[PDB]
């Protein structure tokens, strides 16, 4: 499927830093992951 979208089949690519501006030495893994949010808000946990 990565070959059809003109993407590297290894799934890794070298990313450029935003603060220093230098390219990383080793390639990193990027993608899209489905994240969730749990009912553990800090408004009901912080007390003093």
Q: Which of 4, 5, 6, 32 binds other proteins (CB under 8 A)?
A: 32
6 binds other proteins (CB under 8 A): no
7 binds other proteins (CB under 8 A): no
Q: Which residues contact 15 (CB under 8 A, 6 or more apart)?
A: 23, 24, 28, 30
Site residue total, other proteins (CB under 8 A): 37
With beta carbons less than 8 A apart as the criterion, state whether 13 and 27 touch. Answer: yes
Which chain residues interact with other proteins by CB under 8 A?
Answer: 10-22, 24-43, 45-48
């Amino acid at each position: 499927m990565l070959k059809l979208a003109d993407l590297p089949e290894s799934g890794q690519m070298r990313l450029f830093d935003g603060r220093t501006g230098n390219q990383f030495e080793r390639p990193t893994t990027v993608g899209y992951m489905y994240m969730l949010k749990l009912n553990h808000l800090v408004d009901d946990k912080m007390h003093a």
